[PDB]
Amino acid sequence: EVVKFMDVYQRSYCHPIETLVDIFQEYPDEIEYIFKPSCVPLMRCGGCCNDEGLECVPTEESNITMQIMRIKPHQGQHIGEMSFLQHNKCECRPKK
Amino acid sequence: HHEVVKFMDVYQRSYCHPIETLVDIFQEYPDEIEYIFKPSCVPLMRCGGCCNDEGLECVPTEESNITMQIMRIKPHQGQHIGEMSFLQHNKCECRPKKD
Numbered sequence: 001e002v003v004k005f006m007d008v009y010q011r012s013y014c015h016p017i018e019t020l021v022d023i024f025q026e027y028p029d030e031i032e033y034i035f036k037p038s039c040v041p042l043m044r045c046g047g048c049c050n051d052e053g054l055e056c057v058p059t060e061e062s063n064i065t066m067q068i069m070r071i072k073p074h075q076g077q078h079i080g081e082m083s084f085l086q087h088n089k090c091e092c093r094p095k096k
Numbered sequence: 097h098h099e100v101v102k103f104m105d106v107y108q109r110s111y112c113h114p115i116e117t118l119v120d121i122f123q124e125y126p127d128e129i130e131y132i133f134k135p136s137c138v139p140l141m142r143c144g145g146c147c148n149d150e151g152l153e154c155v156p157t158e159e160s161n162i163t164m165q166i167m168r169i170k171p172h173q174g175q176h177i178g179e180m181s182f183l184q185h186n187k188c189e190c191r192p193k194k195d
Contacts, residue, residue: 005165005177012118012135020115020144037110037146046118048135066101079103 012048014056014092019044023068023082036069042086049092058087110146112154112190117142121166124182134167140184147190156185 021042023035045058063083071077119140121133143156161181169175 001163002179003162003164005167008138008164008166009135011139012137017118018115019117020110034150036148037107038150039110039146040106041109048137052132052136064098064101066106067103068106069103081100 009048014045014047014049014090016043016087016090017046018042019046021084026084032072034071034073036071040066040068040084042084043088045087045090047090051092053094054092055095056090057093058089059091060088062086062088107146112143112145112147112188114141114185114188115144116140117144119182121180125180130170132169132171134169138164138166138182140182141186143185143188145188149190151192152190153193153195154188155191156187157189158185158187160184160186 018041020039021044022039024030024038042064045056047056049056062085064086065081065083067079068082069077070080070082116139118137119142120137122128122136140162143154145154147154160183162184163179163181165177166180167175167177
């Protein structure tokens with residue numbers, strides 16, 4: 001059975017959506033370490049806009065600290081805090 | 097303000113599972129050059145998340161098709177809503193990378 005048009009657009013439109021982020025892509029300055037887990041769930045702007053001209057971007061941003069096993073391989077390793085950017089409010093806005 | 101997310105709840109929530117993820121139609125279908133689409137983009141269940149070992153990688157096992165209605169526009173020429181099928185990952189698990 002079809003996912004009805006109205007219900008697509010409504011559900012796609014530019015909102016914050018829980019998204020999984022590999023720590024090492026987001027932070028490549030964490031070169032000495034692997035992380036456990038490798039990856040975290042973060043609220044992040046995603047989705048279509050009315051016009052192909054617009055793009056879906058944050059307006060309010062905030063911090064979530066989390067505890068992350070930090071491993072220097074074959075060496076010391078320790079759970080530690082790590083702070084991450086989360087997008088609380090999104091809106092469609094012009095590209096450049 | 098807001099308490100730190102406890103390790104248990106990280107791991108549990110990160111681990112390789114299907115997660116609703118938003119996918120540009122033009123990436124999924126790149127042969128569709130003469131059309132824009134409304135939306136630009138659709139919600140599809142897709143494998144995402146950590147694996148215990150940097151050796152493993154998080155991959156689909158069961159896959160399925162989900163038909164959805166999409167405004168198809170040829171610009172300066174208007175349009176037609178029509179059906180369009182999409183790939184969705186129903187079941188994921190961590191498995192070794194040969195890559």
